[PDB]
Design a protein around this ligand. Structure first.
Ligand SMILES: Nc1ncnc2c1ncn2[C@@H]1O[C@H](COP(=O)(O)OP(=O)(O)O)[C@@H](O)[C@H]1O
Ligand SMILES: Nc1ncnc2c1ncn2[C@@H]1O[C@H](COP(=O)(O)OP(=O)(O)O)[C@@H](O)[C@H]1O
Ligand SMILES: Nc1ncnc2c1ncn2[C@@H]1O[C@H](COP(=O)(O)OP(=O)(O)O)[C@@H](O)[C@H]1O
Ligand SMILES: [Mg+2]
Lengths: 146, 701, 373, 373, 373
């Protein structure tokens, strides 16, 4: 958000946006990234680089860009909010939340998210074998940086 | 261990919750449940271990804790209350016919006989052998049941410090109009058909009896035979019971003579003969009148005058006024009804005298009362039935409210006066003296030119503004009363014909001077005991008032027998049938009375999402209502949670629940957009910061 | 709670009292008060200054008998109090201060009579409630009808009241001061033609008994007189209290003839049949057909043999031949007013029409004019 | 879906109600409301404060009968609501909140009458749709014609409506406030010449029955009067409800004569024949020949014997001899308005001409002025 | 040549006779015929079988008094002949066979009455000429007006006749059979509430005298009743012929109240004020303003004190406030019909309107229907 900023990651976030967000039509272009990669000079070729990136959410606009800056990740995610949200679905203040419990909770309620996204989260989330997922260390790592 | 025994301890008591708990208990072969001190029993149509001495000793005294529900708990609770208060108590076994009230009464009788005296069981043997006689004289086939008890049996077991003395049996709320009128596809009392079927032939020749289809008092239903009942076997069993009960051959012959006299009196017709100033009813054939006179040992001319004449008798003269056809019909029906009532009273009095007690200091009363009735075509008899059920539901609600008040003072709290709306307005609507429905009916029974239409118009005029009273839109001959079990529509078709039950002094004098001892004794006793009750409704009200007056010197205990399925299938259950039975039995009146009762740990645990509740182990003084003040701007009205936790009113409860579900929605949205942020993080700072570094280093040396 | 109402049909000649809901009056006795007219010579015999009812007729030969009511109007208000006290205490054996009382009155009486009855009931006997009814309405109640014209005839007055579907037409109400007492006086007068002298008030009772036992109504007067003159088959004997035997002939039907010819006793009024026809013709043209077939007769003076036949004959002669004439004369019409009052006082809806003690205290004795009729 | 429409032809004297598609009205009863005018003396008898329809005529002799409609205008808006409620519930035994209703009205009535009927239908009875039609158009619908001039005469008003090929000429529409009720009043007035007095509203019904049964129209008035005076062969007898017999002579044809000579009741207007001729002459010269041969008569007042013959004679006298005059008087012309309304309400193309509840909610009660006619 | 005409205003209760041109009737006496009802015992006393007029009231206590006229219709045609013979010979002392006679009749009487009067005049008394007039026209003649509505009220009937510039509107003529005789009967009925019994026809005259002397009309009924109930200042005493004194209170103004509320005697008709307003509203809109200011009252029943004030109050309440209401009640309105008849019969131009004996011989008794009115 504009008021709240996580100074550890603001520099990388803004550098990425200034390398991606420019005065253009609005779609993400390979031109700027390729120029940054081959600024020194390299024979341009398409021998084995016919597909660079294809999983952008969609088009980007300066107005929608500012909305995204204010809401999604730029200086957002207060820790108390995450802890309260995770304790809302658990009765123990300890935060031992069964992994399968969160599976159905996420895959049935709200804008439903797939098991693929839950696994994607688990690619970095440390979980016990019995599934009582904890989030202190994971939340700190997400918020400070990596 | 998923089911529960007492639903009073539940935090949210709704009709759906009650149905779910009851069906969960029934699916585990657990019949009996608890509503505070009120037992609920579902008829399983299957033999269950509701007996055995080991159950008696298990429930003996207060050593069990009432963890498992059973009728023996009701029995020993009544015994303990008697030994504590030194006062009588009564147990009311209500419910529909076939719902299991009869064997419940028999099991209670066996349990008391086993646990009180445990040295002599002659009282229970003597009181069980009288059951078939009462069942034959007080049951009939209806459009809903094949064997329905049309009266309230009152068995009083006298106890003297654990010693079982003699028992007194009493009858109440007997249906007088069924003796002379039956609707479609229903019969009279079983006794007439059993007598006409199983009687020896020479008895029939002596009484000039015939098949049941010929008699007018029996053929009105159109189906004089029950598919699945043997009249001869039951009649022989009744003879065996009378022989055991000391009824000699002469007494049985007199009873058969009385019943045959009633049957023959039912077959008398009248013709409209022309007189100088009126129409006069004259008997068609004198054969039936003479047969009745011979069977009852009374004068034939006396009977014919008592049927076709009205007597105005002062000190200095006696005037005979001829009657009309309708008046003669009413007189004949009144004579038949009074004969049957006197005979039943005599049988019960003799049975009581056979097992007469010695002292009267303590007593346990058992009432086997029929319940709510809501058929398709609905009429006067069911109106009286529902009036009696409303008067019983008054006491049921009183007991429920007493338990609620005891719960409110059970722990430590500033006990407030809880509001409670009883069903008094319905009782006033039906039978209040100025303009009650039954009072209007009684007034119309002597008014000059009153018919059913005029009675309906009077009811509509007097009760048009009553919230419980409802008129049909089209001019249909009916009205609707909002009972505790829902709207009930009564069809006014023969309300005036079914209410005429006036017997004059000339008939009583004729019947006293009979040549047989039993009839003369009965009518002399009736004349000695006899009153401004000249209608069926007035006598029903008097009998119900007597029954209630017998039942305030004690604290009643209620047993509610239900029915899971109308097909008597042992195991098959339906939800709509359960809802209908719960509405009719008055169980849901407890839920209506409850509306506050919700728990404490629920608020402790799942209401932290609002302001992320800072404290731990909130105590009796926990910041609880002030939580609402600073979070929801809710008026302080929820009483107190503390130890005694029954505070939350329904609308506040739903408001908080739906606030909670918005909170869950918003928290889920926040988490999901945060997780989308994490996905874009891993995406971008994977595909650049984990790839360009590797490529640059590889290009490096 | 269960306070049974009292129905008291105090007529000019008889008191008919009882409890509401009964089929017959409990107490029926003459409405007379007697006082000694001779000299008491034995010590202790003669300490009673008044005799009321049947005890006044047991001592008939030493007393002067007086009626407190003539022509339906109470003229002696102390004898009436004595009679009411007798009825309440010695006859019904009931305490009036705990029973509502229903009383009757003729349709066209003075208002002071009704006000005084109300005052006496509410101040002397302390009844909790009161109502004053019209005798013809009670006759219809006893007859089991809502439409009809009633010819009530006691021994004070004769009145006609036409009622249709429970609605009365007050402008068509008739009244005659010719009834049983005048018949007794006329019979006493015409018994002198054979040499029988009845003078005192005690012989009035003997003449009344003769009239009740022997008199009848002739279907046609002239041929009856011709038959009585041409033979001696219509004569009957009567035994006097001291053993003397009297014989009367045409006096048997000449006495009740004054009901149809009031000119015998010097009155200009019309007969009961013409009075009934005139009362019918004062009603609406759509009411007359139903009234013609619902002629209800009530009272003791209507108890003569053959009176209904002659009434039907006279009305048929007067009314058009198209209509159907019916005279309803039930065998118990002597008690029809009391029976109707008993039926009315026992109704549950009637409990709101009583004149309570509070209303009397608020409004004076004039409350009875707006509460009743 | 299949919601049958209701046709209610509420006239000044009779209500004709039924279901669309039927061949006859289901309910026909007088449009009267009666109230008791006497004193109720029996307890419980007299709890009804109003009688509507046939039950008001059964109790005719104790009630005051009043008509809610005079001359086609509703003057009592509570009695009219009572009558409509009776028609919908006690007579048709139908729930009005699920049936479109078709009502009729005279051509030249005040607009407030129509607006008030619309408001009552849409707010008190909650009908889903409504339409108000003109009675002469429905008479043509029942007669199976599209061209003709209609002479409708109930007992409130008499009107003429000329229609050619389904096109109405509103400037040629006539109206007279002379109809059956005025005929009943005039007969009541002229019955006093023989000494018969009918005063109350209950005797108005008897006079109306006499008029319906005995009155007729004479082909020529003067020679009919001469014949009636010179003999006694035109006299007929009538029996009153109480049995009295009345006799009337020239009053039989003098009563309907006021339709052709309104001067008998002191009106300056012209007769029905001259009114019809004037209405014809106000149309186009090319329409007159077809109208002359399509004179359609409707209503109960046109039911007199010999009325069509005299109408044809008078029109022939007025119109030129070249034209051909035809008077169409079907035997069922007493119900022609209802039959036409039933035919019209059952058409599938008519379903778009109803006044729906939404249109009323949008436009107020004034929508009926632009949706109807 | 100089044959003075006779004016005979034979009403229901009084006969007013005299000679044309005089200012007052020569003979005024009651229209009664009496016959003995008792037994004559002296030889020679009892040879008279009838008494007519004042001699019938001198012997009132032994006679039965009968009226030949009720409600303006002669019902006894021999008593009427006796009364006319008395009037012509014993009272006026004139020979009828040489004087034209002018008679009066109510506006809406049966025709047989007029025909029979014509026949009796021309065949029994042999008058040379005859005319039958309408009483309201004669009232206007006596009042000196040509425009106005007349409310005549004798003791048989009450009628309204609106006349404008000498032109009568027959369709607006009203008639009520409620007049002085009904008032006498109602007073007789309501005098029983205080215990006064007047039964015979001879006591009807005493009641009539009481009504004439003491009764009056209250300006407003309810507050008058409240004042009479709250005090005793409205009571007056009357002395009976035998010396007994009676007292009446609210009966003084309750008796004439039945003229404005006919419901007291069980009639459905409207009061005289509403009848007059209805008669006015049946006239042309250009006539109403002149009629409102020319309300002429005539007859003996209009002689109550305060009747004109209440009539003006009621008409003002009914009529619009713009109009001016005048009630003309001359002090001699009891004889206005006779005065007008005397004025009319003395005119020279009227000599051509008589019904001569030759015309009667030519045309039968039916000539009076075309010669008169
Ligand atoms: N059987 C009878 N025949 C003739 N007259 C009778 C008969 N019975 C009673 N009466 C007369 O009727 C009168 C009493 O009738 P009742 O109706 O009791 O009068 P009231 O109601 O005024 O007291 C007495 O005069 C009596 O003589
Ligand atoms: N057969 C008949 N002869 C004469 N008049 C009749 C006849 N039938 C009905 N009427 C008169 O017609 C009038 C009713 O006709 P109707 O068309 O129903 O009137 P509306 O339509 O105004 O209700 C009544 O006044 C009635 O007297
Ligand atoms: N001063 C008066 N007050 C009240 N009523 C009167 C008065 N004078 C006469 N009458 C009544 O008017 C009636 C007679 O009036 P009159 O015009 O002579 O009648 P009619 O013309 O019919 O003979 C009588 O009934 C009489 O009682
Ligand atoms: Mg019509």
């Amino acid at each position: 958000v504009f008021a709240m900023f996580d100074q550890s990651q603001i520099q990388e976030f803004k550098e990425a946006f200034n390398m991606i967000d420019q005065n253009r039509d609005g779609f993400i272009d390979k031109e700027d990234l390729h120029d940054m990669l081959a600024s020194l000079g390299k024979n341009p070729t398409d021998e084995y680089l016919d597909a660079m990136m294809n999983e952008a959410p969609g088009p980007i606009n300066f107005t929608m860009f500012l909305t995204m800056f204010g809401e999604k990740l730029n200086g957002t995610d207060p820790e108390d909010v995450i802890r309260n949200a995770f304790a809302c679905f658990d009765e123990e203040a300890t935060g031992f939340i069964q992994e399968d419990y969160l599976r159905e909770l996420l895959t049935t309620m709200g804008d439903r998210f797939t098991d693929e996204e839950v696994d994607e989260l688990y690619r970095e989330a440390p979980i016990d074998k019995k599934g009582n997922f904890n989030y202190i260390e994971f939340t700190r790592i997400l918020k400070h940086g990596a | 261990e998923d089911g529960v025994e007492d639903m009073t301890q539940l935090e949210d008591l709704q009709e759906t919750t009650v149905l779910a708990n009851l069906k969960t208990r029934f699916e585990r072969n657990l019949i009996y449940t608890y509503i505070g001190s009120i037992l609920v029993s579902v008829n399983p149509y299957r033999m269950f271990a509701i007996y055995g001495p080991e159950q008696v000793q298990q429930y003996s005294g207060r050593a069990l804790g009432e963890n498992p529900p059973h009728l023996f708990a009701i029995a020993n609770l009544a015994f303990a209350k008697m030994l504590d208060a030194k006062q009588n108590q009564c147990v009311i076994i209500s419910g529909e016919s076939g719902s299991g009230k009869t064997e419940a009464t028999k099991l209670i009788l066996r349990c008391l006989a086993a646990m009180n005296q445990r040295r002599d069981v002659m009282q229970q043997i003597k009181i069980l052998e009288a059951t078939p006689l009462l069942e034959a004289f007080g049951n009939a086939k209806t459009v809903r049941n094949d064997n329905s008890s049309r009266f309230g049996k009152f068995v009083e077991i006298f106890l003297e410090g654990g010693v079982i003395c003699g028992a007194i049996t009493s009858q109440y709320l007997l249906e007088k109009s069924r003796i002379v009128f039956q609707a479609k596809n229903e019969r009279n009392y079983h006794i007439f058909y059993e007598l006409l079927a199983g009687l020896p032939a020479q008895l029939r020749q002596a009484f000039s009896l015939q098949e049941a289809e010929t008699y007018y008092y029996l053929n009105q239903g159109g189906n004089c035979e029950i598919a699945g009942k043997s009249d001869a076997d039951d009649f022989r069993r009744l003879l065996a019971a009378m022989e055991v009960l000391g009824f000699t051959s002469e007494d049985q012959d007199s009873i058969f003579r009385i019943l045959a006299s009633i049957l023959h009196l039912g077959n008398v017709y009248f013709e409209k003969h022309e007189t100088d100033a009126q129409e006069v009813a004259s008997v068609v054939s004198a054969r039936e009148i003479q047969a009745v006179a011979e069977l009852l040992q009374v004068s034939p001319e006396g009977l014919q005058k008592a049927i076709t004449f009205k007597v105005t008798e002062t000190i200095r003269e006696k005037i005979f006024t001829p009657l009309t056809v309708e008046s003669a019909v009413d007189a004949r029906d009144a004579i038949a009804k009074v004969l049957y009532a006197l005979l039943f009273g005599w049988l019960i009095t003799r049975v009581n005298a056979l097992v007469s007690p010695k002292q009267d200091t303590l007593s346990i009363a058992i009432l086997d009362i029929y319940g709510f009735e809501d058929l398709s075509f609905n009429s006067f008899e069911q109106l009286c039935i529902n009036y009696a059920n409303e008067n019983l539901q008054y006491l049921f609600n009183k007991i429920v409210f007493q338990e609620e008040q005891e719960e409110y003072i059970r722990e430590q709290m500033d006990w407030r006066e809880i509001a409670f709306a009883d069903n008094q307005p319905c009782i006033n609507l039906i039978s209040l003296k100025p303009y009650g429905i039954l009072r209007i009916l009684d007034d119309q029974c002597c008014f000059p030119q009153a018919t059913d239409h005029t009675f309906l118009q009077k009811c509509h005029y007097h009760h048009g503004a009553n919230p419980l009273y409802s008129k049909p839109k089209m001019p249909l001959p009916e009205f609707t009363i909002k009972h505790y079990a829902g709207k009930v529509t009564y069809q006014v078709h023969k309300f005036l014909d079914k209410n005429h039950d006036q017997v004059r002094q000339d008939v009583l004098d004729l019947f006293v001077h009979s040549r047989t001892r039993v009839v003369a004794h009965l009518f002399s006793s009736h004349a000695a005991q006899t009153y401004k009750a000249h209608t069926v409704a007035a006598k029903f009200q008097q009998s119900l008032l007597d029954l209630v007056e017998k039942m305030e010197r004690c604290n009643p205990l209620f047993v509610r027998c239900l029915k899971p399925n109308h097909k008597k299938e042992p195991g098959l259950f339906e939800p709509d049938v359960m809802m209908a039975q719960l509405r009719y039995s008055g169980v849901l009146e407890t839920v209506r009375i409850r509306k506050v009762r919700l728990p404490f740990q629920v608020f402790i645990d799942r209401y932290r999402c609002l302001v992320a509740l800072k404290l731990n182990v909130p105590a009796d003084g926990d910041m609880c209502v002030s939580l609402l003040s600073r979070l929801c701007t809710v008026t302080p009205d929820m009483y107190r949670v503390g130890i005694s936790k029954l505070f939350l009113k329904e609308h506040l409860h739903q408001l908080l629940e739906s606030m909670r579900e918005r909170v869950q929605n918003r928290a889920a949205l926040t988490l999901q957009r945060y997780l989308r942020g994490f996905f874009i993080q891993r995406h971008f700072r994977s595909l650049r910061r984990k790839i360009i570094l590797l490529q640059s280093r590889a290009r490096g040396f | 709670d269960e306070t049974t109402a009292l129905v008291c049909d105090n007529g000019s000649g008889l008191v008919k009292a009882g409890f509401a809901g009964d089929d017959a009056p409990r107490a029926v006795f003459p409405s007379i008060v007697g006082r000694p007219r001779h000299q008491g010579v034995m010590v202790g015999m003669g300490q009673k200054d008044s005799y009321v009812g049947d005890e006044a007729q047991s001592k008939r030969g030493i007393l002067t008998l007086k009626y407190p009511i003539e022509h339906g109007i109470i003229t002696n208000w102390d004898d009436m109090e004595k009679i009411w006290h007798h009825t309440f205490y010695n006859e019904l054996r009931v305490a009036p201060e705990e029973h509502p009382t229903l009383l009757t009155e003729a349709p066209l009486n003075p208002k002071a009579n009704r006000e005084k009855m109300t005052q006496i009931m509410f101040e002397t006997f302390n009844v909790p409630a009161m109502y004053v009814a019209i005798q013809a309405v009670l006759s219809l109640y006893a007859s089991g009808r809502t439409t009809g014209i009633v010819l009530d005839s006691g021994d004070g007055v004769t009145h006609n009241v036409p009622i249709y579907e429970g609605y009365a037409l007050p402008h068509a109400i008739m009244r005659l001061d010719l009834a049983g007492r005048d018949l007794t006086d006329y019979l006493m007068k015409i018994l002198t033609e054979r040499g029988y002298s009845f003078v005192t008030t005690a012989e009035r009772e003997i003449v009344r008994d003769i009239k009740e036992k022997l008199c009848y109504v002739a279907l046609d007067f002239e041929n009856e007189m011709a038959t009585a003159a041409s033979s001696s088959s219509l004569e009957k004997s009567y035994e006097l209290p001291d053993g003397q035997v009297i014989t009367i002939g045409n006096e048997r039907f000449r006495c009740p003839e004054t009901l149809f010819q009031p000119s015998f006793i010097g009155m200009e009024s019309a007969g009961i049949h013409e009075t009934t026809y005139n009362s019918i013709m004062k009603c609406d043209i759509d009411i007359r057909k139903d009234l013609y077939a619902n002629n209800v007769m009530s009272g003791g003076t209507t108890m003569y043999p053959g009176i209904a036949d002659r009434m039907q004959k006279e009305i048929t002669a007067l009314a058009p031949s198209t209509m159907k004439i019916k005279i309803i004369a039930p065998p118990e019409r002597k008690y029809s007013v009391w029976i109707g009052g008993s039926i009315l006082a026992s109704l549950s809806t009637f409990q709101q029409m009583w004149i309570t003690k509070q209303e009397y205290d608020e409004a004076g004795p004039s409350i009875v004019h707006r509460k009743c009729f």
